[PDB]
């Protein structure tokens, strides 16, 4: 299959409550494998998946240095963004970064990603060329110019086409029994009267990995997008995910409705009906 690696950085100021917290988590697809938290009693990079535990002390120390230095730089950055927006010293603010690489089925680099946000809004993003930037506003432009002057894009590109892909491939091999295993959804359809006139049909998908899945209801073969109730895909806590989709149908028309399930773990796309 295709695969990706992403790191997620969050830096949060908290005036009057110490220095900004910095937390980084790293993922391969929908599996987290490391964390670092500057608020930990003893801040260090910690493993979060079994297949990463085999990395040596040199690896853990290298990560910890990277995250410790970033912790300090993001505090500088929070101060800088406060000023770019003429903000008071009273408020809490957040910078987020998410970055990584995507591989195709052949293990080749599809593309790199490096995006940042301030208080939940796009701030600055590296373009797909891994060479130029897109700044959201005149504040982010100050950052753009400073990063252009310092040739930052060449640093990001060198990592994304180099170490990012190399290490993602390494992880994919070490954790191949799980990272390269798609588990198909266990499915079923439930039926619950809502009145004398109508009933709820709910289509369930459980125990699947990765999170990517498509669940849809059709009536007489037509998609019922607008009338379908679709909960967000949710983690079970054992690596797998869950989802359901619900539709309220005229009592007696149940057999006119079909649930369709697409998932990477499925050797064939599923069609289900309610089975009284």
């Amino acid at each position: 299959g295709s695969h990706s690696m992403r790191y997620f950085y969050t830096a949060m100021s908290r005036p009057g409550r110490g220095e900004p917290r910095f937390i980084a988590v790293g993922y391969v697809d929908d599996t987290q494998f490391v964390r670092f938290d500057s608020d930990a009693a003893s801040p260090r990079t910690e493993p979060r998946a079994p297949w990463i535990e085999q990395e040596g002390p040199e690896y853990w120390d290298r990560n910890t240095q990277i995250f410790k230095t970033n912790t300090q730089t993001y505090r500088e950055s929070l101060r800088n963004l406060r000023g770019y927006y003429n903000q008071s010293e009273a408020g809490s603010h957040i910078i987020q970064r998410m970055y990584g690489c995507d591989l195709g089925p052949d293990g080749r680099l599809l593309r790199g990603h490096d995006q940042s946000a301030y208080d939940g809004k796009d701030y600055i993003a590296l373009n797909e060329d891994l060479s130029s930037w897109t700044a959201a506003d005149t504040a982010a432009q100050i950052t753009q110019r400073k990063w252009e002057a310092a040739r930052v894009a060449e640093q990001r590109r060198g990592y994304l086409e180099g170490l990012c892909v190399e290490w993602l491939r390494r992880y994919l091999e070490n954790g191949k029994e799980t990272l390269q295993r798609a588990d198909p959804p266990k499915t079923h359809v439930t039926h619950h009267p809502v009145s004398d006139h109508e009933a709820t049909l709910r289509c369930w998908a459980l125990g699947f990995y990765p999170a990517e899945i498509t669940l849809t209801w059709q009536r007489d073969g037509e998609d019922q997008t607008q009338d379908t109730e679709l909960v967000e895909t949710r983690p079970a806590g054992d690596r797998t995910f869950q989802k359901w989709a619900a539709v309220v149908v005229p009592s007696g028309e149940e057999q006119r409705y079909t649930c369709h399930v697409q998932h990477e773990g499925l050797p064939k796309p599923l069609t289900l009906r309610w089975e009284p």
């Binding site: 980084a24 970033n70 950052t143 990063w147 930052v152 640093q155 990592y159 170490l163 290490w167």
Partner: peptide, 13 residues
Amino acid sequence: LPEPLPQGQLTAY
């Protein structure tokens, strides 16, 4: 592996 530190000074925003 996350992005390594550059040889010079890590650039702030």
